[PDB]
Amino acid sequence: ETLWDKLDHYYRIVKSTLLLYQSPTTGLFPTKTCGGDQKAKIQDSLYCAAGAWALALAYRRIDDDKGRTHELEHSAIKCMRGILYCYMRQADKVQQFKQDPRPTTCLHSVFNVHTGDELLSYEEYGHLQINAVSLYLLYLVEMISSGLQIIYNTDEVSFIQNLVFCVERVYRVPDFGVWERGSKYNNGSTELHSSSVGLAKAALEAINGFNLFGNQGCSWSVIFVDLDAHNRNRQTLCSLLPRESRSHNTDAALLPCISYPAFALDDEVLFSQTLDKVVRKLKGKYGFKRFLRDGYRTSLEDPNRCYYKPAEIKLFDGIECEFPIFFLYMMIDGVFRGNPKQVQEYQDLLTPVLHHTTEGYPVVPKYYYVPADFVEYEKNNPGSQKRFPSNCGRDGKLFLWGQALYIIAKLLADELISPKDIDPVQRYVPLKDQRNVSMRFSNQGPLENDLVVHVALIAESQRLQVFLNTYGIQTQTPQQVEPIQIWPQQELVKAYLQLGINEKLGLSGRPDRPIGCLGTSKIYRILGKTVVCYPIIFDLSDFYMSQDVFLLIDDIKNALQFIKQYWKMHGRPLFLVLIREDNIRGSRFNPILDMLAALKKGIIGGVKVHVDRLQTLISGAVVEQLDFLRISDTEELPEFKSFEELEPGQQPDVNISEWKDKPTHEILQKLNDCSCLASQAILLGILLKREGPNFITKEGTVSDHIERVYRRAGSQKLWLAVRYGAAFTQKFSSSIAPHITTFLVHGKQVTLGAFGHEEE
Amino acid sequence: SRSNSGVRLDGYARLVQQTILCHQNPVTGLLPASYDQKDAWVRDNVYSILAVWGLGLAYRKNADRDEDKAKAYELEQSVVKLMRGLLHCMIRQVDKVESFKYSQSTKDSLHAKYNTKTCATVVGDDQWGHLQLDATSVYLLFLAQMTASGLHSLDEVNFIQNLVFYIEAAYKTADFGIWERGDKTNQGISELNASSVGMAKAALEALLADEVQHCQSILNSLLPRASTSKEVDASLLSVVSFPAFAVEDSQLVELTKQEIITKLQGRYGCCRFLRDGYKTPKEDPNRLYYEPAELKLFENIECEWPLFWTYFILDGVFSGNAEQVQEYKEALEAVLKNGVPLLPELYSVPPDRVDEEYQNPHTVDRVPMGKLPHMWGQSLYILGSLMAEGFLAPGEIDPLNRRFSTVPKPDVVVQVSILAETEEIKTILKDKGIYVETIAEVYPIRVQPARILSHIYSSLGCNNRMKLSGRPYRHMGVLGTSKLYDIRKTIFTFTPQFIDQQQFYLALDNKMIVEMLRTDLSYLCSRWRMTGQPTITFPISHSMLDEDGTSLNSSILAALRKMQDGYFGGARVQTGKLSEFLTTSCCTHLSFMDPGSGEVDFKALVLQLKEQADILYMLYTMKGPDWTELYNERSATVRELLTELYGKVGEIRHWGLIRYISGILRKKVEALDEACTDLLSHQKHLTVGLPPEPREKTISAPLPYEALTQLIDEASEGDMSISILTQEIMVYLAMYMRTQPGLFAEMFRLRIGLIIQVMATELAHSLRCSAEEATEGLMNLSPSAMKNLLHHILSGKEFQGQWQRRRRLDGALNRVPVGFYQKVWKVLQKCHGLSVEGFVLPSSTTREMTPGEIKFSVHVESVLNRVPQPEYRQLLVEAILVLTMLADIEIHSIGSIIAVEKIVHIANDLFLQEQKTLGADDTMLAKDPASGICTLLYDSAPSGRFGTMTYLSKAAATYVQEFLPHSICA
């Protein structure tokens, strides 16, 4: 057989069983091949466009395609510039979702195939499926990489960026998932799914730095991911990884993630721990159960009731529908991972379950259900009964997602397309090649982690540089690095606020959050100047924790250890240890000098460091060019401020209880007789309540005297006062919320509240 | 390139971004018309992206660095995005494309406006007059051009070909126009605009040539006039010049441009058309329509649109020029925002200054209103600037070489293959010297009738997924059935339409076939503008042989021998084997065809039939109407022997009988809707019966074959043997307009009944006989002999009574003098109207008809040319022109509607008195039994002291004497 004949076989199957159904208008493919349903699901269209693109990737190996490469590729662009249209019309929702990711602010995931309009509402359907926004972005990168031009103007690039700002914060947005129901229980509940976070980690790894314009592209067409938000997704997937979610210890949606298309997991032991549970607990003769205790189109499921009631989930144990598609994903995984006998084992399993249409074209039935009469026999001896197909194709019903995966798997298995061809962005990294892949693997490899962070000791003043030199540490004042500009992280957050700003689509820009230690560890070219950012550890704060130098030295060690464990980008990380004259004041000098000295020795906390001059450290380094700032509306470039040289009691005697029963101006009396900054905080804190925010004090507004006592005992290191002060003035740290997410990303749950009192 | 050409390119980039690309919707790619008009017009979107496409082309011809590649890619993909958005706008209306494909109704047309945020529809079908063939045609044209420039599913290809079928019948489809208001009167009346026809022709040429050359016929006939109700439209620049270039006549293009400049061009642009009143201070802003009496008000104060001067820079760039006067005159640009030109939509005479502008035309300082910037005009302004400053070339915007239309195209040599149907026929052809090949020998080339070709195209364009059903069955003329076709790897050649149509008497006459072949060759030699050389397959059938069968028809031999000699039909012809013509033919490939009295009891009255064959037939109408497909009681029915009678009289070729049998059996010409559509295609109206007015039902617009045929039948009022004459004469007029259209000049309303009557009169005076026996011998004429009579009727060739014959010939042909209609416009200014036979042509018509309209012509020809008698009419024509003659010398105006007939008669009564006295027989001059006008008055020459026109001058002067008591003549 010639290649033309070998691939005309797939073009007949693709054209009859997939591209016939593509909407002439939207480009999206319909979920129901035959019928009046107008639903086009987002995920199924992406898998359908990928199937046409896989045939184009095959027809690229024939020069006389007879037009079939342009049509099959341009069908894929049609579907992908149709999902973009559906999303671009709902960009009022992309702005709302960046700011408040929630089940009822999401981009809809089911649209009218004919018109692109919203079909089912938030009540009717769970539209929060971030597997879909995330696979749109993985497929847009994988298709634009192939040569397929899907993004056409700067406004489409700004929407893809705003789509990225949404896909970054997936770790904190629980969703419904590929299966649209949430958990095994259809309680209408969203949960974090390794599958949705895993596809987001993959879209973000693929789209960071990607010209959406392809070869015909410049700096102003690149998408920029947050290295810190991507880390938070990597941390979440890893914490939850052998499993899918609180509810599912295994789901077959993990197979699309762990392997084609995302190829997300970067641990070979977790991939095997995740795949083995999926194959062992979910494989079947007719396919893979989506999840154990699944009621989809089961004989025992009630058709009328949308939501399974508690303990119903037991009735579906052994009756679970088995989806033949998962056999096709396992065959694609085998072609990618070089197992020529996992392709055969699962090809052999699919040849029997595959129906054929009247013209002989293969139909992959969506699910194989146990017929109602045989449910008890299967439950008694699972794997014994014969399950009827869900779609036979002759019925007029075809699973368009499965039809597309047959084309991808059959082409990959027959070697008519290559693993490299369908993963232009290299999502699968073979083990031997897991070395220098950005955001995933570092030169050292997959297992070794002795990163040398490139420290640069920057001193607030020349006075402090000369003082630090006398005591042994060469530091550089902000001016001595003249072309390089040292910026607070907040000044990068201001610059990023101009990324993705489209006023035509109502989009605003990066949400105003803190850039963290994996984004302040990068050298940036912003408006023609080189900007290096001091870490957020060095940012001044109202909270009293800042005063302890030992906590600063520990936050410096803690940050460098995070940079070591989680920085997998090409350059060496750049940590700038800003030293402020307050840091060396008093006996803080001895602790700071030991940190600064260890940074000079090359090790602080097990993290090897190379202190050196910023000019030498920034020299051949990769610089992220922030080209989105431009001039934009204002004919002036934005105004960015950069760090500049700052040129020159034993116990409180007053107990709260015995001194609060008094309402007296006498609390204002002891206030004049309390030298304790803890008695003052207790006495001048009873009054922030009973007399008011401004009840006049001898000193002035009470709000000013507690902030004076809090600040004063903060310096005098009088910690009972600093804590009565912080509390009385109700002080909260910016970091409480960022840290409470470490607990959550790691599968832990924090309870705040005292012991013996109301917990939350 | 960045030294001094990249900076200016960036300046134009800012221009396009801040005028056009700023308003492009990121979701749909469409462009809203303005802030107030948030909807996206198809034509405005297509035109507004031309600047972006040109900038992308500019950027690319100099794209070497990345950044420049990024800008070029962004511009090209913005153009692609806009066109795709317009596609999904049309794709969502596939049910309308499919419906308009067969039934070209305004209620089944693609919408002009679309929601710029969802590619959906904003208003209802009833709410905007959406039928605009120019918008869809300009979209198709620029889709073809952009693709030929490198700008990139099959389902949308099928949709695009269905759109090709949609705009395919635009030469005969009424339109709402480029200005989406139909006719000028502005009552939502769909009208045929040459702008739409030219744009459709350009789109079809860029993307079946038969309807293309039909559109070409519409363009030639209509230009320099725009449509029926428009003397000239400034939108014609979009046809005679960029972007369509649909007129290949350089003289016609120059004449259209000169008409636009002379009539519409003003100090602030060109008015769209005379008496437009789109944004004039005289209209009612909140009233959608226009009363017919306020169109005068709009005269000399129409809004001048700067958009049309962008067309005058574009031509001038496309055709090299010092029309750098059109530029430098566009200093009338709004802002010099920052300094952005912001080309306005129109300039309106300030309201106070209406009287000054009316009186002194193109002189008042108008104000800018409407859209600002006019993105359709702004894009053309930027494109013209780009092209004029050397950053762009005509060959980049026009990669299909549409600009080379005007160049004279050489005569084409039509290769003809004469093919023998049978081998015996081949033997006869050889004895006589024409060496041919049989249809069997021409294998593997398969010869098929043109019906099969028309049916094959019905399978082109079909996707049942989106409910698109091929192409409607359209008759393929000589142009379509002259290319060779590659269907399933075997070459198929198709004989012309006129050969397989053997259902009417025309095919029995071999001379007719010769004449049809000659007309087809003449049409081919002029209208073939296709790659390849056209190939007419001419098989000689057994019916083409003589009576004996051992010899071929003389006429057919003579035609074949002339074709062998290289010339026949005004065309150079090369005859040869069809196998030789493969390498130099338009071998198009059809890839869609690949698989994958007393005694009223009529018991015994037909017994008399059981040999004159005339009488046998005569009885047969008594037995048809009284008794058509009913029984005869001898294993026979009325229709059967009438068909047997028809065959018998065809064998004996006694043509009177064939015609009668055909007439009572209701034989109808299949390609008769084609004949009527061709005659109306040349801006000629048709009327179908005997001349008194109600019977003579006029044909102002094309009619479907069923209606046309039904109109013919009711126009005979049951009087047989004219209903067939109407079809036969219509066919002959169509052939003569295809071949010798000069013969049809100064003719605008073909009266078939009057034509038939004048042919009878000519057969009465030539071969002198009674007018009646001549009316019967007209039946017995061969179809080719009757066509010859018609030729001689038209050209006035002859095989003291002459002047009556001429007056008759010209009146029956409805021939008007050159400039007659404009002269009638002039008298209507003086008088209150003309009255012919009691029907009034009011002066109020001029208040809504500019003099050169072909809608005022029709108004005049419906009040004047309706006169039954052929001559009375030609006299009424004189009395109008002598009224026109004397209106100039007369210095005053009269408040009467002048009855022209009276002037004709007063001249009649003045003809008795003068001739009697000069001394002539009282019986020498006798009155007409129809008109009451002396026969000798008709026989009188026009000029002279006793000329008929002199008598009307002595009559009109004696007619307006009581109306105009005093006449201070010049």
Ligand SMILES: Nc1ncnc2c1ncn2[C@@H]1O[C@H](COP(=O)(O)OP(=O)(O)O)[C@@H](O)[C@H]1O
């Ligand atoms: N004040 C802070 N202290 C510590 N880490 C912070 C602080 N602010 C932000 N971060 C870190 O910066 C990254 C991104 O910031 P942000 O969007 O605020 O994170 P999150 O949404 O997890 O709270 C996270 O890794 C977060 O933990």
Ligand SMILES: C/C=C(\C)CC/C=C(\C)CCC=C(C)C
């Ligand atoms: C000066 C008088 C004549 C030359 C006699 C003929 C002219 C008329 C009878 C009136 C013409 C004026 C019109 C408005 C028709």
